[PDB]
Amino acid sequence: SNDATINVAAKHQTIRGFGASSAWCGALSDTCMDTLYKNAGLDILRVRIAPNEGWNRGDYRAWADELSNAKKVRARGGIVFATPWTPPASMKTNNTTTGANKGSLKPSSYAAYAAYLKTFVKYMSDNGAPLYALSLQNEPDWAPDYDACTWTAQQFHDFLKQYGASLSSTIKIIMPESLGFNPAMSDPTLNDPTTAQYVSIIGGHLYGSPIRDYPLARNKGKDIWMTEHYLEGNDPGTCVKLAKEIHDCMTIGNMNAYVYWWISGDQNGLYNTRTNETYKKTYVMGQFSKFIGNGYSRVDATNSPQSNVYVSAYTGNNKVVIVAINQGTYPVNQSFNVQNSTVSNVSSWVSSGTLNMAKTNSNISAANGRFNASLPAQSVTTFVADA
């Protein structure tokens, strides 16, 4: 009864990875970076481009902490993308780095902003931490009193038709990083082939709006990345909520990558640099990232085989990986049936209120692709098998 059926023959999106941001986290330590990027297996880092007035006279001091973070992640096998929260104040209609009075990028500074971003990309490259991609703006639809800069959907179109060729010849471009992943923010760019061609990755955040598929983006060949979100708490209930959010991004959103908010900026991050302690949300992320390898594809799996259980699955390099979330307050047994592959050597790891990415030592045997297992209360289990 109510099997989780996994069909390795039905493939979905390619998984780029999972990560977090170093924005406003200073220069993170080797221990923090080892914890996250080696042990938990995160492999994407989002750095901030701090507003830098000296950019065009060779003064990069404002950027050196992120350089350091970038190098540490690259040394640990990760890729790095950059997000600017604002152009320098000299380019803003409000004459400040904040979002005061819905400040925006002066159209008379469009060429300079393009040059600015290219200067950051070349800085990072010249110092041995080349970027994988670059975003045009954080949350163009939010105007708070910290680094911010408004853009309308038409402004992104305006900008890209002029400067997208130059920018994309330099680096993969992410846009638009909407507050709530509003497709209207990017639709004008995607629907005009002149502008769509300059975009590689469609990025968005999950504040306020449910997770959704984005068919236009996928059908234009774009990656879809969830580039910022956080949750408050590290109790088991919050941890399984995070797990279900990642699962929903993978499954409903068809997203190629999931990127948590900041590593250490406050108590809602992944690592506490004041006590040198790992927040338990870290291990939720690890149940995906440590086990899902390079170039893996998501495949069909019964999304919810019984109440409060959620399942997704991935294949690559002759492995099958199954992530099974139990949001219930008690353990439950769950059967799995892998189709169109011959599976062996099943091993599992659990993160829960007690366990941190702990190998279970369970003695799982598979016959004709079927095995079963007990899922602890408020837990995430990852099965890895030969396939």
Next chain:
Amino acid sequence: SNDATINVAAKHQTIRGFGASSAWCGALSDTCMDTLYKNAGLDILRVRIAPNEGWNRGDYRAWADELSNAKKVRARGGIVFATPWTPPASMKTNNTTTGANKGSLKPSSYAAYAAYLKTFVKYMSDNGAPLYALSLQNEPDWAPDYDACTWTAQQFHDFLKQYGASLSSTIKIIMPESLGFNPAMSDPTLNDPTTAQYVSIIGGHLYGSPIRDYPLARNKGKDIWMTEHYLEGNDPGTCVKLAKEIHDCMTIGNMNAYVYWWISGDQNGLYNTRTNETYKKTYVMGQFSKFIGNGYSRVDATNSPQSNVYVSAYTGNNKVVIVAINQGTYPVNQSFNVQNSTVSNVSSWVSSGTLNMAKTNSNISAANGRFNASLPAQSVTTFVADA
């Protein structure tokens, strides 16, 4: 609130170990023995002395399978004791090896039975698997239709006043292995100093009667060993029932050792030799045996700090070990406070419906002897710390 307080200064009995029996299990494989005696860390083996009519003409064939079992356990760091379920039929009042018509040992064969047991002890020694102790009889108060032999409390006294000197000069003696650990079966032997002196270990089983302390035995200097019991099932509820039984033997019974019934004789054992699979009761035993070392003493700990949680603790070799059982259906948090020791480097391992003696990777910090942890539903956790 409701701490489990551990006081290393208040010491109780010395722990000899934990084990199981190879009676009627044939000659067990290396894989079975590795599973139990290396990985789970059992370290006591109870062999049966099969009734052997050829004992006095050098025919030991009936004993060779147990010889093999004994050698395997000794090679894996364990000790071995032997239990006879019956003398040979030639010494029985019913002329058979069974318990038919409450058959007993003929008083005219007392000297021969003593010689018989000494022949088994010397056999085992001569072939490189010397025994640690020897029992006079299995379940002298039960007379079933398999190997059996009745003895009254006065018969044990009768026998020991004559043959105990000879027998005890050869080997540590266990008696009386009552069905339900009835102290009346051994009281006459213990209360006469002439007979008490020949006994080293008071052994008993747990069929039908609650676990109890045995002050007379402890006050005469004797070890108290639970030498046979089993439970039916391997579900989490049964596994925590077994854990609580061991805990009760340690705590209420002040027992030095706990010995499960047979390893592989039927489905109620610890290992299935037909499928080469380990029954989950094995891991319950391992949560005690693998972690509680040579010469450790039990110490004071809050027996039940909250409902359905049971705690015991042990020290030795500058370690403290804490076994915490959660019989509840949901996880609970539990605080621990170690007194009169300075503890560091706390690590934990869990056995549950999902986990088999699995290291948790939890990041437990202790300050002034206090730490806390989440105990999964229907689980056994063992903490080990430097002390």
